[PDB]
Amino acid sequence: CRLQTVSFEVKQEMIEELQKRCIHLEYPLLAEYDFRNDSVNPDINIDLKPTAVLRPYQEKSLRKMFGNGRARSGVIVLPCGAGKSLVGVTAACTVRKRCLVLGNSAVSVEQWKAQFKMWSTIDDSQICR
Amino acid sequence: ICEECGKEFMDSYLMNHFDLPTCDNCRDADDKHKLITKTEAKQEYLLKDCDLEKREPPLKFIVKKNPHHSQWGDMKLYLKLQIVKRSLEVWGSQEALEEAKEVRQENREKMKQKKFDKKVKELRRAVRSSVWKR
DNA sequence: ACACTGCGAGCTCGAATTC
DNA sequence: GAATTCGAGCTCGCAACAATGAGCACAT
Ligand SMILES: [Zn+2]
């Protein structure tokens, strides 16, 4: 998969098999985004509005994601009637880079637009579907 | 400024409707072009709506009265050389166009016969289901 | 020198159990 | 390993589109 600080460039098309083998020899791969200082990406004006108050179980899940001031690629399992979507908007409101939301159905993308307009203060020219 | 005869002119029938620098002296009514309507550019040269207004450069049209309505709506007209230049840009060569039309022109008669077997398999299902049971 | 917005067709997947 | 049942999505063709009413503010 190819092609102090030693590095070697890996192929994008088989990044899945590299993560399989790196666990297979107990040197696992982390995905800690260090988002406070990257200087390449145009930080957008997503800001969480002071109307979406988040419950203490949602504040505990986001505290384990943004641990040391650096975002972390994980899986958060909350019930659907619980705040499963507000934690998604608050995580996009905290990294504050180009989010990309994926859903299973064409009805589900009609809801994530309706949640980003409720708690995140975005114009209609930036929530594209 | 022209390209066919190279004469300097202010305006003509062209270059304000289609952006083509061609003088109005000859105008080539049946020589270089005709005025093809919008519905003929969809079923003959087989272009979708993502070919006449999104492929750069986007070409424009001319609105006119409908001939057999006179009170209803529009009738768009395109320039004929602008369409066959777009069909060569979207569909490779000219000998890929008609060859793609053969597999498309059989899809409607394929629908004509596949309508006639689902009409058999449904009407026979209403009478076979009463004799298979006991 | 006709023709806008809706809508069932193939095509290809998925989850889970079948044959 | 190669079928099914019922669901989903994206392309794209198909057929046929419409458009009816009534009055006071500003210059020499
Ligand atoms: Zn000329």
The response to whether A88 counts as a known ligand-binding position is no
Question: What span, in angstroms and rounded, lies between the C-alpha atoms of B74 and B69?
Answer: 9
> Could you give the 3-state DSSP secondary structure of residue A45?
coil
Contact A66, A72 (CB under 8 A): yes
Reference A40, options A90, A92, A91, A98; nearest CA is: A98
| Pairing state between β B77-79 and B35-37 | antiparallel
Find the length of chain B. 134
Find which nucleotide's C1' atom is closest to B114's CA. Answer: C9
According to the entry, how was the structure determined? cryo-EM
* Ion ligand 1: protein residues whose beta carbon lies under 5 Å: B 2, 4-5, 22-23
Contact B41, B52 (CB under 8 A): yes
Does an H or E element contain B121, and which?
helix B97-123
Q: How far is CA B124 from CA A82, B16, B114, B115, in A?
A: 51, 63, 15, 14
- Angle at CA B58, nearest 5°, toward B26 and B95? 75
* Token pair 């019930």 in the structure block, residue: A79
Q: What number of other Cβ atoms are within 10 A of residue B77's Cβ?
A: 19
Which residues of chain B between 30 and 89 are close to nucleic strand C, CB under 7 A? 34-35, 37-39, 64, 66-69, 74-77
H helix intervals, chain A: 15-24, 56-65, 86-95, 109-119
Q: What number of other Cβ atoms are within 10 A of residue B33's Cβ?
A: 20
Kindly give the distance from the C-alpha atom of residue B46 to the centroid of ligand 1, in angstroms, as a whole number. 30
Reference B51, options B97, B95, B13; nearest CA is: B97
Let me know if B52 is exposed, middle or buried by CB neighbors in 10 A (0-12, 13-18, 19+): buried
Distance of B109 CA from D17 C1′ (whole Å): 26
B36 φ/ψ angles, rounded to the nearest 5 degrees: -90, 135
Contact A48, A93 (CB under 8 A): yes
Question: What span, in angstroms and rounded, lies between the C-alpha atoms of B14 and A44?
Answer: 46
The response to whether B23 counts as a known ligand-binding position is yes
Contact B76, B62 (CB under 8 A): yes
Question: What span, in angstroms and rounded, lies between the C-alpha atoms of A48 and A70?
Answer: 18
Contact B97, B47 (CB under 8 A): no
> Could you give the 3-state DSSP secondary structure of residue A128?
coil
Question: What span, in angstroms and rounded, lies between the C-alpha atoms of A74 and A71?
Answer: 9
Q: What number of other Cβ atoms are within 10 A of residue B36's Cβ?
A: 19
**What is the Cα gyration radius of chain A?**
17
For residue B106, how many C-alpha atoms fall within 13 Å in the half-sphere facing its CB? 5
Name, in order, each residue with C-beta under 8 angstroms of B82's C-beta and a sequence gap of 6 or more.
Answer: B18, B20, B59
